[PDB]
Point group: C2
Chain length 295, copies 2
């Protein structure tokens, strides 16, 4: 009756949105990282009554379907229509919504895996549906497929689970530092992203390396005009303590960086001494977890 | 400043819904008729102010965007975003909404043609956009493309304007009788329609004839389970006065029939003597009209 799923938070380094009217053919190209910190989804399922009820909650509080539309879209599709009883989905996030961590993808996939497990289905069907729910509601283009890949992911062929190709990079003794400030809140950037994004991808596929990705990221965040002065200034001070250059979480107001244990300390002293908020998450190398909640 | 467009009402004899996530590739197969009675759309456009305003009205009364979503979708896309002034769209219907006459397609296409004319564009782009607006809002699958064909239309290849193929049948001294009662209001019919619909199409393409279409229609409305007993009974009494068999407006509660002037009279005496409502519309053989409203 109690199923739990964990979906790591996903951060994008640089991207190229490939929009497509066909959900499965819709996606993006780019690179990103997955965190040991993310979303935990719990599916409580009780049979009974003369009715079919689906409730959703965000961090302990019930939410209207209107704020939960993506999760609901996923739930209505997986919970049988002849089914009688109560389905409850409790989601817990390690990050605020709208900060670029892909919580909505976490809720979509987490719900799809937990509910497919309880009512029947497969990994692929769950993933496609969560991808589909993301696309149809403008939730995200590569968080779901990115989360399914784990570790440091690279989307080389646009599309949803099943149709697109992602690759993974090897890395050593790396952790993820994040400075989440807030939500990000033209026609030239749509052009710039198209051109810089694809360029970054090509470069990364030339040199498959986490170090290179961060450099290619920083250049991307800057040559597109996406990087705000307020962040750029924080970056200039951050980069002075790290071997690898920090960069902008893609479509949030924050920065992230791949760091080593020792640097991390310095980065803390520095950041905290700037009244700036910071989190440290391990790179989640595994795949999304799903299973009967037994502890 | 005042542009008028006329889109004939469209009635479907039998169909096959071909759903597709790609608007343009979405459509249907089937046959239908266009009426001299339909929708008149008037686009009043005034430049000025420091703001962009779009208002819509149905039969003289202003309507919220929520009831006008399809027209609004079309209007927001055609009215420039840098545009300052007031755009007003007045739609007038010759039939009630939800009765199977395709008013929503009339509003979509009528608005798209009138606004493309005023702000720039082409017939095809207007048609595709109205088709797209219909599909995205579950407005209809073949009314727009059907209205663009005029007369007695046959959709042989599914799709939106541009991509799909429609054919037209020849006919002689035929008029259209309609008995609009109300709105129509499983999984077996989705199966039946798939199989009977395509069968009807194949048969019609064997014998391209309006007489044959009505017979193939009646058989379709019945072998699918779509035809309600209340209509079927009215049909049995109607068919006794007409040479050609009456049939169900597709997805409404009413019937229609191709009739000759003399029969029409009998059909009136009979119908009126049954407390039943009836309309007579000529088969609109032309194409949708658009142009500066000059009378
Ligand atoms: N676009 C910006 O992107 C952010 C919303 O996407 P975000 O990167 O924060 O992930 P999310 O909301 O947790 O999940 P999802 O990407 O699936 O919608 C907001 O700051 C918004 O202004
Ligand atoms: N489905 C049924 O179909 C009807 C709605 O489609 P209808 O054939 O009446 O055309 P419409 O509403 O005027 O325009 P559109 O088909 O573009 O939505 C309703 O009776 C509904 O119950
Ligand atoms: Ca947690
Ligand atoms: Ca460590
Ligand atoms: Ca679509
Ligand atoms: Ca009128
Ligand atoms: Ca006549
Ligand atoms: Mg979001
Ligand atoms: Mg309708
Ligand atoms: Na997340
Ligand atoms: Na990896
Ligand atoms: Na109409
Ligand atoms: Na014709």
């Amino acid at each position: 009756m109690l199923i739990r799923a964990f979906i790591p938070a996903h951060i994008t380094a640089f991207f190229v949105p490939v929009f497509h009217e066909e959900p499965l053919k819709a996606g993006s190209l780019g690179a990103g990282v997955n965190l040991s910190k993310g979303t935990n989804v719990f599916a409580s399922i009780e049979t009974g009554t003369l009715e079919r009820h689906i409730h959703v909650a965000f961090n302990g509080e019930p939410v209207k379907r209107e704020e939960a539309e993506i999760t609901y879209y996923v739930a209505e599709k997986l919970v049988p229509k002849d089914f009688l009883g109560e389905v409850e989905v409790w989601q817990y996030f390690d990050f605020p919504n709208g900060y670029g961590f892909g919580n909505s993808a976490g809720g979509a996939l987490g719900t799809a895996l937990a509910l497919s497990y309880a009512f029947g289905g497969t990994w692929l069907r769950a993933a496609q549906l969560a991808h589909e729910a993301e696309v149809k509601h403008k939730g995200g283009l590569g968080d779901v497929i990115g989360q399914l890949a784990g570790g440091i992911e690279v989307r080389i062929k646009p599309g949803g689970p099943g149709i697109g190709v992602t690759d993974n990079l090897f890395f050593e003794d790396y952790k993820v530092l994040v400075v989440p400030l807030g939500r990000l809140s033209d026609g030239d950037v749509v052009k710039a992203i198209e051109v810089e994004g694809r360029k970054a991808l090509e470069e990364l596929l030339k040199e498959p390396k986490p170090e290179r990705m961060m450099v290619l990221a920083r250049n991307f965040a800057e040559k597109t005009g996406l990087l705000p002065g307020e962040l750029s200034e924080i970056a200039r001070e951050l980069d002075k303590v790290l071997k690898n250059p920090s960069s902008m979480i893609m479509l949030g107001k924050g920065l992230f960086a791949l760091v080593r244990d020792e640097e991390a300390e310095k980065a803390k002293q520095l950041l905290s001494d700037m009244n700036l908020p910071y989190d440290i998450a391990e790179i989640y190398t595994e795949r999304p977890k799903v299973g009967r909640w037994v502890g």
